[PDB]
């Protein structure tokens, strides 16, 4: 395929395809990292519609590698032998 056809929709991956598809401007490679002050001026400066704010949500959660995707010893007990 072509490498520089790259403009529009699947500009990057395709995380980076469906964000195109929701107006979203800013590359998924920035979203992931983001610091919460660059994602306030997101909101803040830029809007967008609900699917589209969800995506920026959801790229910029995943880049904050925080899920516990541990071992984690808790007493989280929920059908667990």
Same mark, same amino acid.
């Given at each position: ?20 598809? #929701? ?12 610091? @919460?002050?660059?994602? $306030?001026?997101?909101?803040? !400066? ?6 589209? #704010? ?12 925080? @899920?516990?995707?541990? $071992?984690?010893?808790?007493? !989280? ?5």
């Amino acid at each position: 395929g072509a490498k520089h056809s790259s403009r529009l929709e699947a500009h990057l991956t395709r995380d980076e395809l469906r964000a195109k598809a #929701l107006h979203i401007p800013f590359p998924v490679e920035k979203i992931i990292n983001l610091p @919460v002050v660059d994602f $306030n001026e997101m909101m803040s !400066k830029e809007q967008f519609n609900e699917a589209q #704010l969800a995506l920026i949500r959801d790229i910029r959660r995943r880049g904050k590698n925080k @899920v516990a995707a541990q $071992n984690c010893r808790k007493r !989280k007990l929920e059908n667990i032998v």
